[PDB]
Structures are given as C-alpha cells and as structure tokens.
C-alpha cells in the first residue's frame, strides 16, 4: 500500500494511531519484515493526486 511519511512508524506491532487502528492493524506477535521507501517521483501530481 501507500502511506504518508510521518505515519510509516505506525506500521509496527502494538502501535496506535489513525493508520494502525482504523486502516491496517498488525498482530502483537508478528514475525516478518517491512520495507518502506520514498516514492515522491511516481505518486505525486502538481495538481494533486
């Protein structure tokens, strides 16, 4: 998926906030990896996406 830069820290077990609570929740005993990289060159519109 695609999220904002400030909210990337909400993608972690036990976290709380707008994204973690209402959009995407991770289990407490989660195992795996999360990869996030900036994509300002592909998902940005001057008019606005």
């Amino acid at each position: 998926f695609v999220i904002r830069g400030d909210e990337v820290r909400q993608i972690a077990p036990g976290q709380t906030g707008n994204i973690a609570d209402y959009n995407y929740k991770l289990p407490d005993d989660f195992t795996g990896c999360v990869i996030a990289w900036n994509s300002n060159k592909l998902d940005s519109k001057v008019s606005g996406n």
Partner: protein, 49 residues
C-alpha cells in the same frame, strides 16, 4: 513456659506476612502494579517488565 509452642505460630505467621509483603515490590521494574504497566506502556517492553 510455652515459648516452644509459641515459636511455631510466630514463625509461620511471620513467614506468611513476609510472603505477602514481597508482593508489593517493583523488583527492578518501573512500577509494581501489573495493570498499570499494561495501560501505561506498549506491549514490546511491557512484556519485559
């Protein structure tokens, strides 16, 4: 005269009191209340506590 019989009761009562008193110790943690630890902190280090 009856110190021999009194000592058993005193020893047992004091040992039980010590066991009860041991319950209210932080024991190296931030707080000695389990549910306070749960409510005040995220699961990651709440598990350590």
């Amino acid at each position: 005269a009856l110190g021999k019989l009194q000592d058993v009761v005193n020893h047992n009562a004091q040992a039980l009191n010590t066991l009860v008193k041991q319950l209210s110790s932080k024991f190296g943690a931030i707080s000695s209340v389990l549910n306070d630890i749960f409510s005040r902190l995220d699961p990651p280090e709440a598990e350590v506590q």
